[PDB]
Amino acid sequence: MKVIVLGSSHGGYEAVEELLNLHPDAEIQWYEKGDFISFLSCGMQLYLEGKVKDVNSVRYMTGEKMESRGVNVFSNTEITAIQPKEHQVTVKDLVSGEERVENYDKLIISPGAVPFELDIPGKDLDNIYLMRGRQWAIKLKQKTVDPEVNNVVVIGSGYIGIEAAEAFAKAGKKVTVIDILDRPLGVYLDKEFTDVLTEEMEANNITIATGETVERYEGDGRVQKVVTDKNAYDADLVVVAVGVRPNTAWLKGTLELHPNGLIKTDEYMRTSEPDVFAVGDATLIKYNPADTEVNIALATNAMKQGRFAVKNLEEPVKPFPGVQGSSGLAVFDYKFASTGINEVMAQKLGKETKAVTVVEDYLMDFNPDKQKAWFKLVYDPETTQILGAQLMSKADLTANINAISLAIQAKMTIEDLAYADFFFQPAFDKPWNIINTAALEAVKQER
Amino acid sequence: MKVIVLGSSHGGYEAVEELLNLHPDAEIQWYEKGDFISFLSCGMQLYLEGKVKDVNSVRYMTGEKMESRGVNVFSNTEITAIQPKEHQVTVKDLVSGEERVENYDKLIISPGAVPFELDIPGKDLDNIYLMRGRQWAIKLKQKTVDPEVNNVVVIGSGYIGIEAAEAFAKAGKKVTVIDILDRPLGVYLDKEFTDVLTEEMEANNITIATGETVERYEGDGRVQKVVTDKNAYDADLVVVAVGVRPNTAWLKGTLELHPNGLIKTDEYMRTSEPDVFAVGDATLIKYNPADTEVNIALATNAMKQGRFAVKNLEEPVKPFPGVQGSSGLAVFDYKFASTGINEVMAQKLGKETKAVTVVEDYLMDFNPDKQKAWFKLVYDPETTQILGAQLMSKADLTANINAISLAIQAKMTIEDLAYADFFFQPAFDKPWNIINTAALEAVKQER
Amino acid sequence: MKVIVLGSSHGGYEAVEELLNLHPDAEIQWYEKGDFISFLSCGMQLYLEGKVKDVNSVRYMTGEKMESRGVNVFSNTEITAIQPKEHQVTVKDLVSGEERVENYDKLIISPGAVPFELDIPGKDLDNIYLMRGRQWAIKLKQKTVDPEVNNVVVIGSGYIGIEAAEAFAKAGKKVTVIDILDRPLGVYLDKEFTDVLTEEMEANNITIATGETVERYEGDGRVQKVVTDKNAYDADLVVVAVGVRPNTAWLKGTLELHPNGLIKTDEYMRTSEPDVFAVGDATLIKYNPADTEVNIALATNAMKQGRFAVKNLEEPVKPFPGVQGSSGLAVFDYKFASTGINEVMAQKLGKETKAVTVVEDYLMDFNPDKQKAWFKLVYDPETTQILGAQLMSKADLTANINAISLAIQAKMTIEDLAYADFFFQPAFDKPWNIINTAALEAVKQER
Amino acid sequence: MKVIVLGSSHGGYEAVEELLNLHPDAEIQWYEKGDFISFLSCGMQLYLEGKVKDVNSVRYMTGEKMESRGVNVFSNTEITAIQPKEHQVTVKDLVSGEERVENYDKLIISPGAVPFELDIPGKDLDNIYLMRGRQWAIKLKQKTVDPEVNNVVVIGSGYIGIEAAEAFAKAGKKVTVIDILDRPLGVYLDKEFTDVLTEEMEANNITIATGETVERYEGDGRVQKVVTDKNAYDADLVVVAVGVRPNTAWLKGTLELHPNGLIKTDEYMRTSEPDVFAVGDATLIKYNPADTEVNIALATNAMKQGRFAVKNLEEPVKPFPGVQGSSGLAVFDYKFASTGINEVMAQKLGKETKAVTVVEDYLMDFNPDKQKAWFKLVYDPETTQILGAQLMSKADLTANINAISLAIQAKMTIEDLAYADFFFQPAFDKPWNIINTAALEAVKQER
Ligand SMILES: Cc1cc2nc3c(=O)[nH]c(=O)nc-3n(C[C@H](O)[C@H](O)[C@H](O)COP(=O)(O)OP(=O)(O)OC[C@H]3O[C@@H](n4cnc5c(N)ncnc54)[C@H](O)[C@@H]3O)c2cc1C
Ligand SMILES: Cc1cc2nc3c(=O)[nH]c(=O)nc-3n(C[C@H](O)[C@H](O)[C@H](O)COP(=O)(O)OP(=O)(O)OC[C@H]3O[C@@H](n4cnc5c(N)ncnc54)[C@H](O)[C@@H]3O)c2cc1C
Ligand SMILES: Cc1cc2nc3c(=O)[nH]c(=O)nc-3n(C[C@H](O)[C@H](O)[C@H](O)COP(=O)(O)OP(=O)(O)OC[C@H]3O[C@@H](n4cnc5c(N)ncnc54)[C@H](O)[C@@H]3O)c2cc1C
Ligand SMILES: Cc1cc2nc3c(=O)[nH]c(=O)nc-3n(C[C@H](O)[C@H](O)[C@H](O)COP(=O)(O)OP(=O)(O)OC[C@H]3O[C@@H](n4cnc5c(N)ncnc54)[C@H](O)[C@@H]3O)c2cc1C
Structure with a gap:
């Protein structure tokens, strides 16, 4: 099978990797119009x-290392058009100017x-x-x-x-x-x-x-x-x-696009054309907090989508599991992390939420290493299912957002998290940790 | 209603707190045989x-602050016996030597x-x-x-x-x-x-x-x-x-005890005697990794059990949600965290597990702050449901164990975690974070 | 020759060391009434x-290491009296209570x-x-x-x-x-x-x-x-x-003592008795700032005096060179150092001095590592000879006081130090360093 | 009086400052051919x-701040020639190309x-x-x-x-x-x-x-x-x-120059021409270690020379006091400092020296903050007068070289420094500090 993967960034790259996992048999061509492979x-x-x-x-890949595993890497080569019907693609070597046609059995694109x-x-x-x-x-x-x-x-x-x-x-x-x-x-x-x-x-x-x-x-x-x-x-x-802005102008009329340029795809990453799959910033993704789909231009999302496209290359067997939109960043002395629905997302989605914010030291008062921590837990008014959370501190408490990402996916409630088992050791947290405390405040608010 | 709570440590204390939440009406007596209230x-x-x-x-409570909220605190007073039938308890003021009988409507004990x-x-x-x-x-x-x-x-x-x-x-x-x-x-x-x-x-x-x-x-x-x-x-x-060793010798014959001294209780914290509830180190707890019950002498567990006993004081309405046994500690330059089933627990339980361990830098190689991290993901051979995980590094990555604790409770699989949404930002983690990478290795091992 | 040295602290110890340098031939006895040799x-x-x-x-010496070099160490043995005339000393083994007489050719005491x-x-x-x-x-x-x-x-x-x-x-x-x-x-x-x-x-x-x-x-x-x-x-x-208070009560009438108990000695460390020398806290020392002698109970002083006593054991050939009273200490975030005459010393001595204090960053303003430094230069009104200096900063600039100690001894003037060669490198100091700047301010004040 | 100062760097600048101290009356012109005043x-x-x-x-001066004190600053203006006889100088405004003649009563140059x-x-x-x-x-x-x-x-x-x-x-x-x-x-x-x-x-x-x-x-x-x-x-x-290389080509034949281009000057900074003084990198300086004169291109030296030229403007009254060539620098984790004669200088000068090097922890062994320190003391074979010293450590002990700079100037001996008063406090040094210890080793070597 000849599989063409467009783009050497997160969506394109994880697709090439998954092709090596599940299809070591295939002829793989990897295209990148820029001079550099996989810059992060x-x-x-x-x-x-x-x-x-x-x-x-x-970076996280060199073109030279991918060729060593039998992938045909074409840097400085732009895919200019797709002929899905014919299962051909038009590519142009930007160094030489020479255009050519390339055939494919399956095409996966991550235009960004x-x-x-x-x-x-x-x-x-x-x-x-x-x-x-x-x-x-x-x-x-x-x-x-x-x-x-x-x-x-x-x-x-x-x-x-x-x-x-x-x-x-x-x-x-x-x-x-x-x-x-x-x-x-x-x-x-x-x-x-x-x-x-x-x-x-x-x-x-x-x-x-x-x-x-x-x-x-x-x-x-x-x-x-x-x-x-x-x-x-x-x-x-x-x-x-x-x-x-989605890099999809060249695809208008070849593939079905949403009014803002995002490529229309289903939960198996298939476009409107058979054998053409699309992933990454240029697509929508299943968003589990509100069981909907939204555009979240994050590397994590592109990576997982790239792999799922290869998983569904011959038949729709692996529906995409969905994401919660998680982020984290340090801004000068503060480190924050966030997942799910917050005010701005709730307004875009038109979803009414309820929430509590706890701002107190994250360690017990007798421990001088204690520092102030902010944690906001957003939940569904009706079901009290966890819809999002945000936290911040000068201490790095960001890995806790990974617990909340799963709680939302699992449709856990504020009562589930209030009594959820999280370890306690006084150099690391309080008897009821940062998540427990916010959730107990949320049940208190729903009395 | 007069509620007597034995013990001023984690189980006793959270029971007093939950009584104040759900029963501000009640006469509460809090007994502690030692001279100090709530030492941690x-x-x-x-x-x-x-x-x-x-x-x-x-500490996390003074006797003097609890009396300010209408709780009758009796430090240096030991409950010597229970007469469940009569709904009386024998207590002894250790300062004066004077014994007395005290009546109750409900009794919650956390002997430790x-x-x-x-x-x-x-x-x-x-x-x-x-x-x-x-x-x-x-x-x-x-x-x-x-x-x-x-x-x-x-x-x-x-x-x-x-x-x-x-x-x-x-x-x-x-x-x-x-x-x-x-x-x-x-x-x-x-x-x-x-x-x-x-x-x-x-x-x-x-x-x-x-x-x-x-x-x-x-x-x-x-x-x-x-x-x-x-x-x-x-x-x-x-x-x-x-x-x-459970502090239960004095209760032998009053309450039903397991052969090792632990008080027999159900998922509502009720003992064999009506209106007597027991929590903490002296009891077993629902252990969700293997849908069984084990004895895990941890503060987290005692705390949640203490609250659930008050929740079920008048009728069995809130079944305990279960715990995963989570821990975390720093040992000199290393910080580790653990939840669920590992080798020793699997042997005690007689459960066959499968597992993968990934040992590599937790940040991408171009970032000089990168440090080695160890992560082992334990899963069910048949269902591939997440049964436990352990991690360690000189970097503090412990809050990730909170995500795994929920994954086990939710009965998530290695495929769920392989593609689970965890944020990526290169000062904090790799494109596929520490949990993602281990889970992808586990699916690789099940090919 | 049999030389007895009293005291295992700074004065006694450096005397034993100098005896090993200049008299490896001699029988040396080292007495200490306490159980521990040379605690610092x-x-x-x-x-x-x-x-x-x-x-x-x-510590800086064990009794056990001194015996290895042929010194007879008697810990827990107190010299109770001196008979200079007879060239004998009364000693008492405090463990056994047994008193004895010991003979000497030369005796050096550092009672403290x-x-x-x-x-x-x-x-x-x-x-x-x-x-x-x-x-x-x-x-x-x-x-x-x-x-x-x-x-x-x-x-x-x-x-x-x-x-x-x-x-x-x-x-x-x-x-x-x-x-x-x-x-x-x-x-x-x-x-x-x-x-x-x-x-x-x-x-x-x-x-x-x-x-x-x-x-x-x-x-x-x-x-x-x-x-x-x-x-x-x-x-x-x-x-x-x-x-x-000088530990000299036992010596009253054996040796001549000043009204406050200090042993009278000359610049060769000889007491009023031939062949008995005394050093350390119990004596006066030549103080070069004012060409006088004062009591300065410092380890440095005891150490140098101990050596000079051995230097003058057989004949007065090495007059003591004098000291400037130098100190240094950190008090929480600050480190200070001082040498020579300051206000309190000038009042005790009745000496009129003049002085300037410079308080400014010790590094040039463009360097963000700059910190405030205090330096006071005290000088003679008439000759403008350097009589003392004090400095302080959260940066450690104390070693500069060693330069001032020599400037005072050498009878250098404020004009000498104003143009004295001190290196400049902007990570370490300003073009005119901390000493230069103070001295230039002092000449400015004498215009 | 009209005083022209050439150069806005260390020699030129301290001359302008000293003119303001001793001659606030004068018309001062300060010339700099470059576009920037006093870059360090x-x-x-x-x-x-x-x-x-x-x-x-x-930097340490702006042109704009000097004009505020009545100095006429001419940046981008080069002095092209001197007519000492006529007491005139040729200057050229490099922005406009316009040459002119300027008169002076005294001229001080620091060409570098x-x-x-x-x-x-x-x-x-x-x-x-x-x-x-x-x-x-x-x-x-x-x-x-x-x-x-x-x-x-x-x-x-x-x-x-x-x-x-x-x-x-x-x-x-x-x-x-x-x-x-x-x-x-x-x-x-x-x-x-x-x-x-x-x-x-x-x-x-x-x-x-x-x-x-x-x-x-x-x-x-x-x-x-x-x-x-x-x-x-x-x-x-x-x-x-x-x-x-001295910036003196333009002066050849106007002023007497040494074969390597350095301007010949006496200890009062006067050139071969009356009323023309020269300082800085382009001159020789009195070097006190060997009572000679050498070229040491250091900022400290230029600074002091600049001031001494103004001091001797009307008559030779202040002979320059001499320098010891002191330096200090950090090279990665090490900080070193040096003054006087070392091997290379001794070879250039043809001077036989003797020396000892002590390499040991600078704090007493019981203090865990102890670190290794290197100190070499160079002295005269005949007189044992201190001729130089070098030290190095990862601890910053550089300010001690300031003490040695004065010891050399004062013609102190190894016996003087062996017993010199330097404070002792065990967080800062050993009983006999770094200088004392080296000097005691030097007397040991001369036994
Ligand atoms: C500064 C910055 C910081 C970010 N930080 C984070 C972060 O910390 N965490 C996180 O999760 N996300 C982060 N992101 C977002 C993340 O990088 C993107 O979501 C991800 O790169 C999108 O991947 P993609 O493959 O869909 O597209 P892109 O990254 O846009 O890559 C598309 C690639 O394909 C090539 N290409 C396009 N069209 C063609 C063509 N026709 N033929 C050949 N080649 C073509 C392009 O040259 C490009 O190299 C950040 C983004 C930026 C810009
Ligand atoms: C050194 C140490 C470190 C630990 N670290 C952690 C950790 O980091 N994280 C974590 O989760 N867990 C930790 N634990 C475990 C945790 O502290 C226990 O699980 C928890 O204290 C048990 O609570 P409890 O209320 O069941 O019993 P206990 O703590 O044993 O308290 C029982 C209290 O009741 C009193 N009492 C008993 N009988 C009577 C009576 N008859 N009448 C009146 N008073 C009575 C006792 O005096 C005692 O004060 C640690 C334990 C120890 C000892
Ligand atoms: C807490 C403290 C901090 C100090 N810090 C510093 C500092 O940082 N820098 C500094 O320069 N100085 C410091 N000093 C001062 C310095 O320690 C003293 O100046 C020095 O110890 C005096 O030495 P010495 O030999 O004269 O007497 P002492 O230290 O008093 O020692 C006399 C010794 O002789 C013994 N002895 C006395 N009489 C007899 C006898 N009859 N027979 C047998 N044994 C006898 C005593 O037991 C004692 O061990 C400090 C002092 C103290 C107490
Ligand atoms: C990178 C570096 C690091 C150094 N570090 C140190 C250090 O840490 N410690 C230390 O003591 N020393 C250090 N020095 C040496 C020190 O900087 C010099 O010794 C000092 O600058 C010399 O001063 P000067 O006035 O004699 O000459 P210069 O610095 O050469 O200045 C002469 C100035 O006069 C101007 N000029 C020249 N001719 C004319 C003219 N005809 N008309 C008008 N203007 C003219 C030039 O443009 C120049 O600006 C360092 C030097 C360098 C380059």
């Missing part, structure tokens, strides 16, 4: 901050997403950067040590926007994060968390300008100013981390 | 090691356990100590700084035995842990883990003498030598942490 | 604080000093301790971890008093230092320094009660209260570190 | 290593030195850098984070060469230091020290190629290889830190 953009901050020194080590750019005045002024991929990573590292960069403006206060802000602030630049949303990191955390995070960032030379629409970039040749409807800010460098 | 023996190591300076802060003592020659030689309670804690702290103590022998290589060994080694004493069992901490961890832990402890002046039966203590007036069948060891202080 | 009381704080665990390692005790009401109440020697060190360590000790009162705010206060405060006790003097550590530092040190100690649970005379100790059997003329303080333990 | 090249490593983030903060460049094949290949000044500092920082730089070769194993090597190694590059000299840092330290330092650097990805003459640079357009007589090395960047 998730590690870009570790690199920019100087924890990881070599940009080229921030492209950074959304603000189509406003001054869009083509120099030093308005993006943050995705190796090329942007090295350019951004050039700018961290550039003595001509003093003020950095990052547009977008999400995950990437805050990583960019932290890296440039730590590097010694004055940063302003600008967004129309009124809370940084609202997709991940609720207000009692984002207010502490805002305060923490402000203590580190970051202004966070919420509720502002960017209107135009000003400057002679290069940016010099970012102008919003409420204010104007000096900028020597801009980092645009506002959103992502 | 779980924090004794933090104290001995000098992280917590005041022995009296290692007593350290098992080796009935061998030299048993009454001075400086053979135990490690449970406030009185022993202050005596053991006296010995950590005693210049006449050089060699310390701790008998019992379990949880308490190793805490005692670490505290005395850190304090500067030569320690030898002695046990007939061939592995330290075998109740919690399997051999690939306990070999690393043995090596770590040996690097810290601790000899671990496994496979040896202690025969006699030698010394003139005070210990001077501990003699086993394979060897003899100098000892200035001995700490006996070999086991626990 | 200078290391008692490191021990009490738990940095050094074994009390017996805080005894802690001064306040002869007031309640002087014989239990738990009023002292801080000198091994026996007191182990007793004080017993008290650091005693749960019955809550309030500790140390009387005397000098070097020892503050070590005692820091050790007990760090151990978790409430401390009050009491003294009639109005400044802690005034013998070492001037007010701009002791005010910062007072503030630092107060931030660590230490009250410093200056200007108060202790009148009586109160308590039933054991101390319970310390009463001064201005106030009364609860005390579970008292540490008396107010002064020292 | 001594702080370039702190900057390259990322401890100091802003290149522009690494220029990096020596190897006139070999390939000298004009791109990426062969130097390390002096702001412009080179920012270029070198560009290269630390450049992903195309892998191998860095620094030619010259002196102070600057090793700073450059450490900065690039810490930044993640493979470094090779190349020099004809057989020991790195030989001008500062002797072999027992430089062998430990070599080993330390090799443990950090630095090859140190001693005894090799560089013959040619190879590469197409940019360096690619450095070829020596014994070997060839790949190089993406070269840093040339081999020497300095």
